Amino acid sequence: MPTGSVTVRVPGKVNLYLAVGDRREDGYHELTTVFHAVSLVDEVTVRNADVLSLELVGEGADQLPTDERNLAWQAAELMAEHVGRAPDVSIMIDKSIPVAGGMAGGSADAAAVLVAMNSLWELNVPRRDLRMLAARLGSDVPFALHGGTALGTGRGEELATVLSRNTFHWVLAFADSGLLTSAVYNELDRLREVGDPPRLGEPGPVLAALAAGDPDQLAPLLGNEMQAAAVSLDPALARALRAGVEAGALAGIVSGSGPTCAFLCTSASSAIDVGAQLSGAGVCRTVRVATGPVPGARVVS
Numbered sequence: 001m002p003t004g005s006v007t008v009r010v011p012g013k014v015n016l017y018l019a020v021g022d023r024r025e026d027g028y029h030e031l032t033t034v035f036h037a038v039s040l041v042d043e044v045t046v047r048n049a050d051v052l053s054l055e056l057v058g059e060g061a062d063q064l065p066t067d068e069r070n071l072a073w074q075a076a077e078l079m080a081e082h083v084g085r086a087p088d089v090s091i092m093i094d095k096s097i098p099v100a101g102g103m104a105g106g107s108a109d110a111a112a113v114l115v116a117m118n119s120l121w122e123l124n125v126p127r128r129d130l131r132m133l134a135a136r137l138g139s140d141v142p143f144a145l146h147g148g149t150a151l152g153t154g155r156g157e158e159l160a161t162v163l164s165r166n167t168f169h170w171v172l173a174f175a176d177s178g179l180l181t182s183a184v185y186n187e188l189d190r191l192r193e194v195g196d197p198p199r200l201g202e203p204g205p206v207l208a209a210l211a212a213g214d215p216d217q218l219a220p221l222l223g224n225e226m227q228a229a230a231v232s233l234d235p236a237l238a239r240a241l242r243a244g245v246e247a248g249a250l251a252g253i254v255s256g257s258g259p260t261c262a263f264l265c266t267s268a269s270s271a272i273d274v275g276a277q278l279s280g281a282g283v284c285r286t287v288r289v290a291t292g293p294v295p296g297a298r299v300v301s
């Protein structure tokens with residue numbers, strides 16, 4: 001019967017700051033990160049149906065599974081189970097977060113499914129239950145629910161919200177192929193065995209520049225301890241980082257293990273010109289402008 005539909009908009013993210021602790025056993029690394037949600041988004045529409053189904057549209061959407069191995073599918077199952085229900089829902093995802101872009105689009109979709117089902121079934125399970133479900137689903141789901149900018153400590157503990165005085169303007173560029181996050185951690189571990197790569201300061205100055213809304217202040221503090229390793233596995237990333245800056249960006253970094261390179265610019269006009277130049281210059285398959293921070297998963301219907 002029921003018939004209505006709920007759509008939830010949810011953003012991709014970039015890492016403005018990433019410190020990576022020394023390898024533990026069993027083999028993991030403790031991460032400290034400043035997450036920043038930006039205006040490349042997916043929209044996820046959920047309706048009552050006879051059985052659970054999932055469909056995706058948008059560039060690259062045809063690469064993605066539409067069964068259990070999709071995190072948005074797992075989210076519906078977990079959300080339904082949480083409230084003792086069958087996940088009798090159909091899910092349609094309009095994808096504009098670049099696929100395999102390293103912006104955590106799968107985790108964004110999972111978070112949007114939680115929020116959408118909450119509203120469609122008129123439940124209001126509390127935000128803290130959604131966060132607990134997000135954490136079972138995978139380590140980037142919680143931030144997709146939180147959005148804006150947050151500091152995360154990698155310990156299962158609560159994200160710390162950071163507010164910004166003004167909006168920031170980015171160019172995001174995506175390589176034609178990503179790297180295995182496994183390969184990047186191994187290469188990080190190796191470079192730390194044979195040399196002394198860049199160790200970042202603690203994140204307080206990043207937070208203070210974000211708070212000030214000041215891109216000239218934030219630009220030189222952007223940092224990623226995985227970057228030297230990504231750049232050792234894919235040396236073109238170094239030229240690409242230079243081109244973005246030559247094109248007029250304040251600074252660029254690789255986000256996470258890649259493929260995103262994120263370039264902070266001084267303004268919307270400036271981001272449009274840097275993006276036009278980069279796109280013209282051929283270093284990257286895809287170039288897009290975005291702003292941040294933007295909100296996490298929210299109903300927009």
Ligand SMILES: C[C@](O)(CO)[C@H](O)COP(=O)(O)OP(=O)(O)OC[C@H]1O[C@@H](n2ccc(N)nc2=O)[C@H](O)[C@@H]1O
Pocket residue numbers: 027028029030031139140181182185256257
């Ligand atoms: C969350 C990220 O660390 C960065 O966005 C990555 O997406 C990695 O997450 P993941 O691949 O789901 O993590 P797992 O499935 O447990 O294992 C992937 C491999 O990446 C390495 N890895 C991942 C996370 C982490 N904090 N430290 C680890 O060194 C692990 O050695 C692991 O063998």
